[PDB]
Design a protein around this ligand. Sequence first.
Ligand SMILES: [Zn+2]
Ligand SMILES: [Zn+2]
Lengths: 43, 74, 157, 190, 248, 147, 54, 310, 276
Amino acid sequence: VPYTGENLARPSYGPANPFKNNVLTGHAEEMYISEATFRAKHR
Amino acid sequence: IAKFAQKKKEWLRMQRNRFGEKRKGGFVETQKADMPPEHLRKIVKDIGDVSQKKYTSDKRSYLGALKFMPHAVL
Amino acid sequence: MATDVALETTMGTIILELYNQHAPRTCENFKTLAARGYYDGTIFHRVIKDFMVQGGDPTGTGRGGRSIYGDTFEDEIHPGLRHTGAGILSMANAGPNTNGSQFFLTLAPTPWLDGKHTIFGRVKKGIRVLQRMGLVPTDADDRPKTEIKIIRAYVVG
Amino acid sequence: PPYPNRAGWRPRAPEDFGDGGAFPEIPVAQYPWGKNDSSSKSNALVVQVDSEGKVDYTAIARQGHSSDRIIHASFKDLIPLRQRAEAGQIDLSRPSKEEVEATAERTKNALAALVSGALAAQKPKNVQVNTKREATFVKYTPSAQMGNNTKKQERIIKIVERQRDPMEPPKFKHKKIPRGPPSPPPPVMH
Amino acid sequence: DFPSVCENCLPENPYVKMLKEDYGAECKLCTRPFTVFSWAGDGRAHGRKKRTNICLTCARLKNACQCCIMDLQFGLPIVIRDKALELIAPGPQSEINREYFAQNNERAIEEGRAKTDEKARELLRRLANSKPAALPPPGPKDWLPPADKSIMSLFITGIEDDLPEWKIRDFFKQYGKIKSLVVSHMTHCAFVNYETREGAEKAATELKGRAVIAGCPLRIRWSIPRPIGTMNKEERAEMLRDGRSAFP
Amino acid sequence: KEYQGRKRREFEDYIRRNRLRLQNWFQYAQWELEQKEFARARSIFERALDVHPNNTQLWIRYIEAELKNRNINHARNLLDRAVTRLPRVSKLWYKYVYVMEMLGDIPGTRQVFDRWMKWEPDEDAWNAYIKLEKRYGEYERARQIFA
Amino acid sequence: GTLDIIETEDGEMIAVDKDGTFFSTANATDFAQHKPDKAAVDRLVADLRKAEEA
Amino acid sequence: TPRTSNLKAPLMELSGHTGEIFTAKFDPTGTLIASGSMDRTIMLWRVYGDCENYGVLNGHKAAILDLQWSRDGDILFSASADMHLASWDLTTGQRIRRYIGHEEIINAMDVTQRGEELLISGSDDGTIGIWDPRTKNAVDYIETDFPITAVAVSEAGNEIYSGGIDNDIKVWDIRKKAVVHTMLGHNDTITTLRVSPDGQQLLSYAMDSTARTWDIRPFAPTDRHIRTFDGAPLGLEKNLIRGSWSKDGKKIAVGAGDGTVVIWGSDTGKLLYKLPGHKGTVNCAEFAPDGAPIILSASSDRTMLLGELI
Amino acid sequence: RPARPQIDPALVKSERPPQTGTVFNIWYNKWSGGDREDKYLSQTHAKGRCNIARDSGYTRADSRPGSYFCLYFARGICPKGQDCDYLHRLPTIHDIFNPNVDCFGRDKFADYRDDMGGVGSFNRQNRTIYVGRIHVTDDIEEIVARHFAEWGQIERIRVLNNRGVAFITYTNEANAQFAKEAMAHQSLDHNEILNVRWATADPNPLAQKREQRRIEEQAAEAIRRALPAEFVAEIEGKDPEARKRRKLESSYGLEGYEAPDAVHFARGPNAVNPRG
Ligand SMILES: [Zn+2]
Ligand SMILES: [Zn+2]
């Protein structure tokens, strides 16, 4: 229900604030890529 | 052929590297081998009595292995 | 051509002076929604101090709002009306020509929304009620922790 | 002046605003309750208001606690609940079986993690190496920089736990620190 | 569970291989054990891996990068940031005071209790742009080289406190070859011992006892190399007025 | 600084031996006030308040140290904190209304009294607030207080 | 604008507090900016000094 | 927020694989689930009841890249990067046999469900194996010159739609062993090819993040492309993402590398859902075959999410 | 040129300190059973010194980007030559280092040693070394100027004659660290054992003022790099053209608005100001 295309299409109203990172230097998220993927891109 | 030759080449490379039986953990795995007895001999001869200042970073582990000395005696 | 709209809230009563000469479609949209009772028990989902009090959303989230001309209607930027000071009623919109049901209302002079928001009234009474609604405590997403709702909105003429 | 013949009118004071409300048709900045000069970084708490607009001192009561701490701070917390005007019918029922089992599961998980911690502390596991030393991947969207606001590239981090020497004792001598002060003491509701 | 390390301390490769060790090191700030994250650098330098040096609690309380210990908002050392914009926060560094402070802040932050400095650096730039008988001119005996070729030292007069020896030495180095250069801002004096007599003579003939160095007028002549003692306040005052009156 | 370090050491040795003794805390804070270390004396008073959170004598000492050294805003913050902490101790309420009447803020005195009346105190506090309004001539306000 | 000066049928100055914050700084949002007079602070301090001396 | 299925929860999580889940398929009756994953295993679950991992199939020497069921749900077929297919009896949980003859990684396989049962396989040696599920030897093999990553069988049972590196969906006739015609328009390698339940249209998803529906009925214009659905970006893993049609055919789902299963309407073209829930790329997205609103998403998270579409 | 070897490993062999005790402690590698006075007075002469012209050259650290200087090259006891992994060079003004490390790669500390010896502190950006045990003559200022000018680039030399102490303030902290490590236990024109430490904060209020002013100059440099030059001009307000741009842009239409500094300088992609 929250993930219906209409609900995702409707944006939040109102004007922007004239005045959400979990790490102090950015946003870090746990991820599940493949080891071969990491090794190939690193190479 | 002449337009997809490279795309075929790296597709085959990447698929074989990822799904080969030899890299079923991301890397080529081998059995742990035996070293030369002269390697162990050189290590114990060099450290000697642990008296030279080179071996301080070893001193904490050396004395720590005292906990496991009863297994070595048995 | 001014019309009174009374918002009885949990912090006092706001009397709104609606400008029928300047923004007539938006003003009569506000009259019809208040008269039907679309604002009864509806909360002020955003309060930002020295900027704004926004309400009118029946879902309380900031994405809802259903007008009387279908879903949305056009912007009425009459070039004589500006966001000149505190207590000025405007229509909150996602973008241009997207006015729905949520009403923006300035707590301070905000003259950077001219050309993109439709002023259609002001407060005629209740400016201290509005001030204290600006002084409530909120969270990181500006929603009031202490709950503010329009108990009943109706029309006086 | 009434609407819409306020042309030429130009207010000077909240007297002229009446019960307030700026006039959008006048092209001058208006202040229905007075100009704010500044706030020159005072260290004062921000004055807030309660549900029905009165000045609230429970901020003082709640200063230094979390938001969900239950703090009794008013005479209303000393009046028997069945005589509090805001309530008419109190639901005094113990939670149902599903809520009890959800609670038991959540607390059994948290306590089980602590039991495993206590067990591994009480019995160090002979050799403190793990065979299952797999890697965690972290997606890492960065924020800007110290001094640069240009955006820069998204980062995949491969984190592995380091192979430590199994013969090593612990590295650091422990210290005696006095225990810290309590959580801010609650109002004494006598 | 993830370090707060800035992008210049992080590798240039966007794909990072980090090592994580619980209780790996003492924090440099609070001297408590914390989880260390370390990564191999960019150039296979001998060195070590670049690691986090302070804990996440100290990084959050000082708004610092966890490797470089620099301020996350401007790229300054933490002491420079907080000294110049001192209205952020102090910090304790006595022994059990610093562990006590860190443990109380960490317990508070973790159990829930407990963007801010725009005004501070606007004020800093406002403050920093708020800005802070007659002696004769030199004569033919003053700009003429003496016949005593053993006298090599030139003497500079009227030195302000903000006149540094690196630019003084660069100026006299693009003129000639310097053996030594002594500058005392306490007595507004300088001695210059050159290496080449010809170079010293041609430079002093070029300047004629007058020099414009960074908007500071200086009188250069010849004098015997003398130890700058604890001169009188009137002596250094007249020394300063001589340096000022080098230019009419 | 040598003498001050010696005195600070002896004071904190007695706090470690017996933290439950108010006189240990009191003499330490009074000595720092005499040395004009107001941050240090404040810190001692607050650590004493961590050990004795509900002690009326301690709250009064701290409030009076601020008022004696003319830290009126510090003292009013302490007075709000103290009548929040101990709302049925009429001594702290009386001290707060007395301090505001000395400072000449008669609306401030009325504010403190109104918060007290919300706590529904005893007859002596209701009488004191009636007598405040009679002192300043507001007989209708005193009539409302009798209601 | 918090006080209305009105005249009734008797033609007299009656002030009306629109809020209730004329007489008390309770419910006043600006209750924390009464900076007291220097004479008042001196009188309170001398009161406390007299208590200390006694 | 109603209740639209006979599940224990509106969304359940099935975990227990120790590697990326590359495929997950429903029973023809839609009550059992077989998931094949890079820990070289197949895990067998019951969706109803509460949920129960009732089976584990072991024997493959590399990652399980595809699997399919029989017409009635007693034999499971699976293609794996050990260059083998395998057929497994699920009453005894034992491998019936292995199908050998492919020389590279077998990327895809399909099973012909009507008429008489067959196995079709597409593999990186540029081959499409036609296997009878009674002999370990291949009945036939189509020999291309490009690797093949997705295969599907026409409902008639004698045309094979195959896509691979060459970005073209080649429709082949089996009995001629020859290409009838090539649908063109994709730009990167086709990851899934699936026919609709009524049988007149073909979903294809490629690595250019476009899911295109094509026409399949023999009367069609020269450009056979119906629509190009968007909303599911390929991430940074070059995985073979497997979408599906709804049982009624009105909905069309694929997986997306941002951990999201994306569902459109096949008739209209509007993004019906963008359901989240996964931390790796979503490798498989399957609608329930019994007409339920149940959606299944299998990711490289070592887990899968089984939800209802309320 | 390649880095030359300064001495030879035949005298850079590793061996015990000379015996000042009954028994050699192998954990702490120290002599035991002796006294304490001997240790206090014993501070021997340096065994070498290095030359920019003769010794400084190229090495595998000049090959490898982002490496450190050689501490043993600074002490003049580096027999490694071209095969050392650390730079054989004086730092220039472009050689900067983070607060957590010094120019030799050794970790810096939150504190100082109680004798102000060692690596240094990141809690004070100290560029001033303290050179004691100087033979008091009249040419001491010339000798100090010559030797420390050889060791780097100087902002302020302050030599006291009463106690024979030279305070040298370099303009680069790396230069100060190199000078301390290269001048400890060395000798001037007379044979003496220099006590080169980190100087304490100067109690002279002129020096306090100039150090504080340098702190705000460095910080404001960082601020002006962080902020756009047009916010810099508007906030600085030293010129009337940027002042009148400030009034107009803060007006945003309406006369007499004077927008808040937070709203007007709130940086972001789409906040208020087109300068963002
Ligand atoms: Zn720390
Ligand atoms: Zn950093």
